[PDB]
C-alpha cells in the first residue's frame, strides 16, 4: 500500500524553488519507505557485486537540493545507475528529504540503484550530529528508531565488475578475505572497532607507510603500500571511497590506485569545495562530473 510514485513526485516537486522548500511526507509513508527498503537490502548481498556503467557518489549529509542537482546533471534514475557510498544524514538541513528520496529510488529501481552504509548511518552517531534532532522536530522519536533498524541492514561494500572496490571509509588490517565481509550478519550496529568499523571509518594517509592511528579517535589510517598490496592480492584496479571532504570533489591517492569522492558542494556552508560524481562507463573508463557553485 506504498504509493511510491506519489512520494517521489512530491520529493522532486520542490526542484528549483527559492527559498528552499521542505517536503513533509506522512509518518506512514516514511515508515513504508524504511520497511520496504529494509527488505530489499536484506534480500541483496551485504557485499554488492555490481556491473558498469554506473555513477558513484560520496557524502550528501542532508544537503537535499545538492542531491537534486546531482540527479539533474548525472541523470535522474533510471537514466543512470547509481551507487552511493554513505553519510546521507546529519549536519545538513534536510536529512529526511535526502534519505527518503534515496530509499524511494532504491525501492523503485532495486537493480539499478544502490546505497552503502556510512558511519553516520549509525544510531550512536546520528543521534548527535543532527538526524535525530530533525526526526524529533518534524516527526517523532519512534520514527528515528525505525530509521535505525533500516540503517542496520544497509550493505557495507560493493565491487564493480571485479575491479573496483567501494566502501565509505577504507581498508582494514583485519580484511584478509572478501568472505569476511560476506559473513557479516544483518541487522547489525557498527562496532567501535574491527572490520565493520574500519570499512566505515578508516582514512588513507600519505605520511604513514603501513597502518597508523586515526586522528578521529576511531579506526586507522593506511598508506600507499597497503593500498598496493590490497589491490594486487585481490586482483583489483581501484579503491573508491568517500568519508573525507576534498576541494575538487574527488581526489586521487597512491598514483590513482585510490580515489576519494565527496558529493556535497560547499560542505555545510563552511567549505568552498566542489562536489563530484564518478562516472564509470561499460569498459570501466572512469571520469568525473563536478558540481560547483558559479562565482
Amino acid at each position: 500500500s506504498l504509493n511510491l510514485d506519489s512520494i517521489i513526485g512530491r520529493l522532486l516537486e520542490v526542484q528549483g524553488s527559492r527559498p528552499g522548500k521542505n517536503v513533509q511526507l506522512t509518518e506512514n509513508e516514511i515508515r513504508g519507505l524504511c520497511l520496504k527498503s529494509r527488505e530489499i537490502f536484506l534480500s541483496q548481498p551485504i557485499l554488492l557485486e555490481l556491473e558498469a556503467p554506473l555513477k558513484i557518489c560520496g557524502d550528501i549529509h542532508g544537503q537535499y537540493y545538492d542531491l537534486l542537482r546531482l540527479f539533474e546533471y548525472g541523470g535522474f534514475p533510471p537514466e543512470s545507475n547509481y551507487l552511493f557510498l554513505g553519510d546521507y544524514v546529519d549536519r545538513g538541513k534536510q536529512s529526511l528529504e535526502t534519505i527518503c528520496l534515496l530509499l524511494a529510488y532504491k525501492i523503485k529501481y532495486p537493480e539499478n540503484f544502490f546505497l552503502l552504509r556510512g558511519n553516520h548511518e549509525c544510531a550512536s552517531i546520528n543521534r548527535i550530529y543532527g538526524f535525530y534532532d530533525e526526526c524529533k522536530r518534524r516527526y517523532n522519536i519512534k520514527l528515528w528508531k525505525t530509521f535505525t533498524d533500516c540503517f542496520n541492514c544497509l550493505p557495507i561494500a560493493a565491487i564493480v565488475d571485479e575491479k573496483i572496490f567501494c566502501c565509505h571509509g577504507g581498508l582494514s588490517p583485519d580484511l584478509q578475505s572478501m568472505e569476511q565481509i560476506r559473513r557479516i550478519m544483518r541487522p547489525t550496529d557498527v562496532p567501535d572497532q574491527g572490520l565493520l568499523c574500519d570499512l566505515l571509518w578508516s582514512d588513507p594517509d600519505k605520511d604513514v607507510q603501513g597502518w597508523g592511528e586515526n586522528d578521529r579517535g576511531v579506526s586507522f589510517t593506511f598508506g600507499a603500500e597497503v593500498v598496493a598490496k590490497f589491490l594486487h592480492k585481490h586482483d583489483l584496479d581501484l579503491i573508491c571511497r568517500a568519508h573525507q571532504v576534498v576541494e575538487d570533489g574527488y581526489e586521487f591517492f597512491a598514483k590513482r590506485q585510490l580515489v576519494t569522492l565527496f558529493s556535497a558542494p560547499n560542505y555545510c556552508g563552511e567549505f568552498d569545495n566542489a562536489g563530484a560524481m564518478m562516472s564509470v562507463d561499460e569498459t570501466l573508463m572512469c571520469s568525473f562530473q563536478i558540481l560547483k557553485p558559479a562565482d
Partner: peptide, 30 residues
Amino acid sequence: RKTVTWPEEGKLREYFYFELDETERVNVNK
C-alpha cells in the same frame, strides 16, 4: 574481463555550475 582506465586529462572532468544561495547550506549543530 575489464580494466580501469582514465581518459585524456582534458576529458577527465566535466563541470556543472549552479547559482549559489548563501542560505541553502547550514551546519545544524552550530
